[PDB]
Write a protein that binds this DNA or RNA. Structure first.
Ligand SMILES: [Mg+2]
Ligand SMILES: [Mg+2]
Ligand SMILES: [Mg+2]
Ligand SMILES: [Mg+2]
Ligand SMILES: [Mg+2]
Ligand SMILES: [Mg+2]
Ligand SMILES: [Mg+2]
Ligand SMILES: [Mg+2]
Ligand SMILES: [Mg+2]
Ligand SMILES: [Mg+2]
Ligand SMILES: [Mg+2]
Ligand SMILES: [Mg+2]
Ligand SMILES: [Mg+2]
Ligand SMILES: [Mg+2]
Ligand SMILES: [Mg+2]
Ligand SMILES: [Mg+2]
Ligand SMILES: [Mg+2]
Ligand SMILES: [Mg+2]
Ligand SMILES: [Mg+2]
Ligand SMILES: [Mg+2]
Ligand SMILES: [Mg+2]
Ligand SMILES: [Mg+2]
Ligand SMILES: [Mg+2]
Ligand SMILES: [Mg+2]
Ligand SMILES: [Mg+2]
Ligand SMILES: [Mg+2]
Ligand SMILES: [Mg+2]
Ligand SMILES: [Mg+2]
Ligand SMILES: [Mg+2]
Ligand SMILES: [Mg+2]
Ligand SMILES: [Mg+2]
Ligand SMILES: [Mg+2]
Ligand SMILES: [Mg+2]
Ligand SMILES: [Mg+2]
Ligand SMILES: [Mg+2]
Ligand SMILES: [Mg+2]
Ligand SMILES: [Mg+2]
Ligand SMILES: [Mg+2]
Ligand SMILES: [Mg+2]
Ligand SMILES: [Mg+2]
Ligand SMILES: [Mg+2]
Ligand SMILES: [Mg+2]
Ligand SMILES: [Mg+2]
Ligand SMILES: [Mg+2]
Ligand SMILES: [Mg+2]
Ligand SMILES: [Mg+2]
Ligand SMILES: [Mg+2]
Ligand SMILES: [Mg+2]
Ligand SMILES: [Mg+2]
Ligand SMILES: [Mg+2]
Ligand SMILES: [Mg+2]
Ligand SMILES: [Mg+2]
Ligand SMILES: [Mg+2]
Ligand SMILES: [Mg+2]
Ligand SMILES: [Mg+2]
Ligand SMILES: [Mg+2]
Ligand SMILES: [Mg+2]
Ligand SMILES: [Mg+2]
Ligand SMILES: [Mg+2]
Ligand SMILES: [Mg+2]
Ligand SMILES: [Mg+2]
Ligand SMILES: [Mg+2]
Ligand SMILES: [Mg+2]
Ligand SMILES: [Mg+2]
Ligand SMILES: [Mg+2]
Ligand SMILES: [Mg+2]
Ligand SMILES: [Mg+2]
Ligand SMILES: [Mg+2]
Ligand SMILES: [Mg+2]
Ligand SMILES: [Mg+2]
Ligand SMILES: [Mg+2]
Ligand SMILES: [Mg+2]
Ligand SMILES: [Mg+2]
Ligand SMILES: [Mg+2]
Ligand SMILES: [Mg+2]
Ligand SMILES: [Mg+2]
Ligand SMILES: [Mg+2]
Ligand SMILES: [Mg+2]
Ligand SMILES: [Mg+2]
Ligand SMILES: [Zn+2]
Ligand SMILES: [Zn+2]
Lengths: 49, 104, 86
RNA sequence: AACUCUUAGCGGUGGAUCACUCGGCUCGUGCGUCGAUGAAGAACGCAGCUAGCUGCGAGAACUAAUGUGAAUUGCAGGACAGAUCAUCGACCUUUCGAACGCACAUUGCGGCCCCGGGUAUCCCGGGGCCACGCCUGUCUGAGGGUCGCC
RNA sequence: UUCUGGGUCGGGGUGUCGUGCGUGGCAGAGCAGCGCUGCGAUCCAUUGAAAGUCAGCCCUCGAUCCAAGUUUUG
RNA sequence: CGUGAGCUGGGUUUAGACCGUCGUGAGACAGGUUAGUUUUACCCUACUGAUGUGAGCCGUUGUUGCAAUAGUAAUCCCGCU
RNA sequence: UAGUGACGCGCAUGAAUGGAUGAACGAGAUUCCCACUGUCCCUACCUGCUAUCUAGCGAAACCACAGCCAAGGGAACGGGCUUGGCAGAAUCAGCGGGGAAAGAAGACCCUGUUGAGCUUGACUCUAGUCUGGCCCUGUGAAGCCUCACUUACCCGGUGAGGCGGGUUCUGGCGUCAAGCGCCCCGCGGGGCGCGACCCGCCCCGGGGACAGCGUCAGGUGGGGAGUUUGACUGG
RNA sequence: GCAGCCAGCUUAGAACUGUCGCGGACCAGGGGAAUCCGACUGUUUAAUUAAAACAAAGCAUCGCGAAGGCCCUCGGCGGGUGUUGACGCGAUGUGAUUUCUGCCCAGUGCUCUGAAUGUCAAAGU
RNA sequence: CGGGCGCAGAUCUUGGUGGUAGUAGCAAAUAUUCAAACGAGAGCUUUGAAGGCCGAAGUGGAGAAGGGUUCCAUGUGAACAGCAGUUGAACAUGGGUGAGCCGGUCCUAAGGGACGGGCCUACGCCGUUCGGAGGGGAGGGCCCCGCUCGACCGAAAGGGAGUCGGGUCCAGAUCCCCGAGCCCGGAGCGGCGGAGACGGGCGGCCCAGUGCGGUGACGCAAACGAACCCGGAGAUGCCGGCGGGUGCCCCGGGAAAGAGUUCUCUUUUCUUUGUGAAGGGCAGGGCGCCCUGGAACGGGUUCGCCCCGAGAGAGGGGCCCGCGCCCUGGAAAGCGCCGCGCUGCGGCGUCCGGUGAGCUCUCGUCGGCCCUUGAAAAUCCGGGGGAGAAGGUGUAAAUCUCGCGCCGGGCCGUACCCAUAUCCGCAGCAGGUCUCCAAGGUGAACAGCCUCUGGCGUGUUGGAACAAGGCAGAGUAAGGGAAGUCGGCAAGUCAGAUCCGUAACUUCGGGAUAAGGAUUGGCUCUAAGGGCU
RNA sequence: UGAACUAUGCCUGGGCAGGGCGAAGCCAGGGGAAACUCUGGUGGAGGCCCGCCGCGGUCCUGACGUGCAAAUCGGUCGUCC
């Protein structure tokens, strides 16, 4: 909704900044141990609650 | 004929969401949110059903920005009591005081 | 009816994020969290759920100040003094 | 011919088996230390490139000190190269939270003191405060409650 | 697959429906203007007209095109 | 007591409800009455039709045919004389 | 065998466990008539979307092994066994005979010393409630009981505003005292008293050692709790 | 006393007219005579029963004057009815109107006595 | 020597893989076609044209809740979007939500919940304006005056001061830009002006003056005033009739500017023809408001009513609302057309009327209905009150003067979707989910059907056939007409409107559109039903 | 631990074309010796009627029934101050 509280908007701001894929140089660091961001969420298939 | 929409978040035909159709210089018919109609004061007697005369019929907080002359008349109880009952209040006050002198 | 057509009428939050435990169990009309008991002064922690106790006991968070006591204890809670300079 | 079935080779599918193990489990030992001086927990934020984890708190991927003695490393870049790491007695440590001015699906609404600025007034910013219960003491009081003095 | 043959059009036959558009009318309840003229459903004539008719109707009478080339078999 | 992935649910035989009898009652009736979700075949056979089929051979291919076997069918009535 | 109207020793109708009646109303149950129609005689034709074929895409239920029959016997209805009939690749579209087809540890029935919902005149209790004793509970008087006392206790009212004893002639107006007395400041200013009586021990009323509380005791108690409600048996 | 001008939209009547067709599509009650049940409107088993079931107005009974009736709470003589006061609140039955509603108090239950003979706890004697 | 020591079963557990099976299936809401472009690649993207649909109770345009980046640009075409994809709500990289006057914030509604007290072994519970020594504020200068005083929380649809016009972006907008305002708060001088303030009687003296007008309703830019009290506004339901005003629609200009048609006809058809807030003025509407006066032969008057010696009619006034028109705004801007230039400058126009059982919205007015009476509070205002303050002859105290000037207005939300693909139902699910706006024709209609504005490709795919059997078209069907069937199940008949005609029974209301009839088109006329000078 | 579904209550909001029957009240005109009646019009009441939206969900025991859907779809239908 357009009507948001500051806590909800601050909560959605954090989840919006975590929905970024891993940097490419991370796979060169850990030896391809972390291949992808397993915590990527889509706005349709998984909701926040 | 063009179909116009609301200009605010409120989407229900409540008493605060009242509009009127206004034609703009851009030849557009837009909604213009109206103020609720005010009421002129009633007489403090509680008998006369009509409202007082010589007083603006505006909202309560609009009376704060109006001058004092626009909120009463130049009579004794003007602005709170009607002229008809003020005459009755004067004659009732006089005649009762005269009956209290007869008993003395 | 009782099934699919009833799930469409769900657009009113019953619980929100609690200010004490951060969980989405703060009942709005009751004004009481369902997970930590906020705003009651004492946290609800029942012994009939070892897993629930395991998820929010001491040691499951940061322990910003309790981990420092562990380091200060092994030195006798030394205060006021400083190491001998070079 | 094909198709079907059987047999073996090879190739797939699949993941068993085996070998491995910075993990678990169990036993034993020594300690046995939270918090209004703000705990546990939570939220948010913090990296040159950083999502998570982890570590930190606007001094935010660590400061100082001490020990150590040349690295960190994915890529750079840059070390005032005493690098880095460990220890950790100094310092720092946002918000919510027993959470404490009143509240909170609100970064909502107040009050006091002081300081600085625009100019005592007001406005703006900063600092210190204002919860509840209770103890000792001070101060200010209350009641012909019991007296004294009149 | 050229002695030819096969298509596409056209024509005719057939049947279906029902008298086309346009034009004309000294047909038209009338009405409106100056006998004239305008408006006017319908009506008459042209006009058993018009329309469409093998795509699974019939017959060519003409016109204009077309002739290839998949796989396999003793 | 052929035949509900053939149908139809009228009846019986869930839960609603009424009447009568019975029971203190909850309820019962082998009494009556009213309303009451009839799900799935694309698998294998069988059957119905439809392609194709003797992988070995101077066989390939076409026409006209023969035919085992299987199916099988007609039925009853009236009027005149 | 329906419907309606009658008949009524009515298995087993009946009067607020309401009887009888009844306009209007009814997606209520039932009977008949007209009209109407493919409901039927008796089926046919047309259209769309499918089924079908194709490109792409692409499941599930189900599955001991499987899948031609007749009889036989058999756990008394084979698909396999016996004796016969017999039997030819690989498939398509249908189809609903069979697979005692699938779906579901039969819901009917019985059994279990397995429950639950519910009901009573089941067994055993229980909240509540009634009643008695004790307790808070004292005081005075009269003949255990009655009547009094207020201070316990209880209730009501109020912004705890006048307790005890010594303004009705109108749908006005009423707000910190006029006035008088006394006294103090340097004609301006201030205080006190009367006005507005004194005294008093409880704010004013209504109860009153009774209600009520606490605790035992008796009754009541399917409101509630727990549990039971034999077995044998041609089910 | 009207003349001039302006302004619509309906209604009625008539002629003519086409193939007697014309609410031409669309929109849009089949009707009648009876029985049963419930008066009606309303309500109900979300996902098999929309009904004759529930409710209903009406009718009738019952309880209760507040230290009360009914009911809530582990508890405060706290709470609901109750910002209430019998034309009210609470508990039931029946089910509009019309017409009636008979007989039975033995049984069960409720209730009222106490010239109450029995049974009869704790405590007290 | 010690075991977690040997599996085919347990509708075993976990994981994996088959047959079925290139099978069922990708079949609800009419629709696509041609060409071109980009591209390795096109039924599906884009562009144009064509033909269609949603048809204003939209498949349209905007919100609430909810979602939370889904918004926008660019790139990619692996995976996903049940065919494809050059496409996407996918992926990747960037960007985007700007407020004193929109909302939150303020108020209390139901309610929640502290406080006192009580209860509870206790965590705690009860209770909610009551119940405590519950006031933290004074005026007056160390003194007397304050509870009707019960914290606080609780509405993004209640109450609640004040922002509108034009323009601008790839996405923002009543927030940005420009322009025009407004509200509130703030000012020992609160900055000026005006008001208070106009003069009298004696010859310098002395005395006034907290405004003024109208018979009145009431009017003037202002026009002292506390405690306390009174009252008003906030703040009143539903329904019906009528009237005023906008918007829309409609009609006439033989009106202007473009455009469509022009085979024939059409002085034709279509489109565009405008002005914000605030302020001033004036129409219009309303008034149990005033003065004069006096009514029966009662009169006035509405669609209905209602009104009148407690005073009509009539005449003359007063007040309120004026969202209508004019003006300031403000034509400079906006639209329409034409012209030049370039890769922004000019010209012209933006006109004049008619109406309505028209539809909405709104402001009014008169009623109807209730054994139903249809909120509180913040806040604001008027009056009563005359305690006080002010100066002694020109001023002072004081000022509700949108007269004017000066300063400030913090915090949070703000993109987008809002549903046949951004919400919920495991999904781009035929389900569910609160509102606003709403055109032309037909017609009684917000019915169905068609069209315009806007939107769209037919709803998770195309192509070719047109067998059986289905589902739907509520397709049609000779003769018979319920013989079908448990049963007229099914759908068939009837249907609108006008004119006639309507029984049994009844609670007199009804039954009733009972039943049963006739009529209905087109065209050309006649007649009647109005207003205005 | 839940009343985001649903049941009831409370508070504050929102919403419901066009027609039909047409009650009180009112007006005027007839009939009558009077009591009073009759006719027309007006008026617009109703848990009134038809019916759209909405809210419901009768029948087809239609569709669907590994569905669009763990209850949906179509027509029909109930109500719609
Ligand atoms: Mg979702
Ligand atoms: Mg604990
Ligand atoms: Mg072998
Ligand atoms: Mg292998
Ligand atoms: Mg802290
Ligand atoms: Mg041919
Ligand atoms: Mg037999
Ligand atoms: Mg049988
Ligand atoms: Mg069978
Ligand atoms: Mg069956
Ligand atoms: Mg059978
Ligand atoms: Mg049956
Ligand atoms: Mg049954
Ligand atoms: Mg039955
Ligand atoms: Mg039924
Ligand atoms: Mg029969
Ligand atoms: Mg009979
Ligand atoms: Mg009997
Ligand atoms: Mg009786
Ligand atoms: Mg009986
Ligand atoms: Mg019914
Ligand atoms: Mg078998
Ligand atoms: Mg099986
Ligand atoms: Mg079993
Ligand atoms: Mg046994
Ligand atoms: Mg049991
Ligand atoms: Mg049970
Ligand atoms: Mg029991
Ligand atoms: Mg037995
Ligand atoms: Mg009978
Ligand atoms: Mg009924
Ligand atoms: Mg009855
Ligand atoms: Mg009903
Ligand atoms: Mg049901
Ligand atoms: Mg029903
Ligand atoms: Mg009944
Ligand atoms: Mg009765
Ligand atoms: Mg009874
Ligand atoms: Mg008896
Ligand atoms: Mg083992
Ligand atoms: Mg195994
Ligand atoms: Mg982004
Ligand atoms: Mg795909
Ligand atoms: Mg691209
Ligand atoms: Mg997009
Ligand atoms: Mg993304
Ligand atoms: Mg609040
Ligand atoms: Mg509001
Ligand atoms: Mg209100
Ligand atoms: Mg936008
Ligand atoms: Mg002056
Ligand atoms: Mg005064
Ligand atoms: Mg009105
Ligand atoms: Mg005054
Ligand atoms: Mg927006
Ligand atoms: Mg959907
Ligand atoms: Mg979910
Ligand atoms: Mg129309
Ligand atoms: Mg509308
Ligand atoms: Mg329409
Ligand atoms: Mg398509
Ligand atoms: Mg879709
Ligand atoms: Mg067919
Ligand atoms: Mg059919
Ligand atoms: Mg038909
Ligand atoms: Mg026929
Ligand atoms: Mg028959
Ligand atoms: Mg038969
Ligand atoms: Mg039928
Ligand atoms: Mg009838
Ligand atoms: Mg509710
Ligand atoms: Mg009906
Ligand atoms: Mg309807
Ligand atoms: Mg519906
Ligand atoms: Mg349906
Ligand atoms: Mg039915
Ligand atoms: Mg039926
Ligand atoms: Mg069905
Ligand atoms: Mg099927
Ligand atoms: Zn008055
Ligand atoms: Zn919590």
């Amino acid at each position: 909704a357009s009507h948001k509280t500051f806590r909800i908007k601050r909560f959605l701001a954090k989840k919006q900044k975590q929905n970024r894929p891993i940097p490419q140089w991370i796979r060169m660091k850990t030896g391809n141990k972390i291949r992808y961001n397993s915590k990527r969420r889509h706005w349709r298939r998984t909701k926040l609650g | 004929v063009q179909r116009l929409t609301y200009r605010r978040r409120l989407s229900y035909n409540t008493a605060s969401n009242k509009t009127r159709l206004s034609r703009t210089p851009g030849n557009r018919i837009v909604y213009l949110y109206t103020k609720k109609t005010g009421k002129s004061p009633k007489s403090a007697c509680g008998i006369c059903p009509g409202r007082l005369r010589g007083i603006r019929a505006v909202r309560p907080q609009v009376l704060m920005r109006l001058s004092k002359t626009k909120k009463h008349v130049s009579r004794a109880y003007g602005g709170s009591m009607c002229a008809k009952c003020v005459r009755d209040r004067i004659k009732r006050a006089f005649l009762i005081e005269e009956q209290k002198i007869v008993v003395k | 009816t009782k099934g699919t057509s009833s799930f469409g009428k769900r657009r009113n939050k019953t619980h929100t994020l609690c200010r004490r435990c951060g969980s989405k169990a703060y009942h709005l009309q009751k004004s009481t969290c369902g997970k930590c008991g906020y705003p009651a002064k004492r946290k609800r922690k029942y012994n009939w759920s070892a897993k629930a106790k395991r998820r929010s006991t001491t040691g499951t968070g940061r322990m910003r100040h309790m981990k420092v006591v562990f380091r200060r204890f092994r030195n006798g809670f030394r205060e006021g003094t400083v190491p001998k300079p070079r």
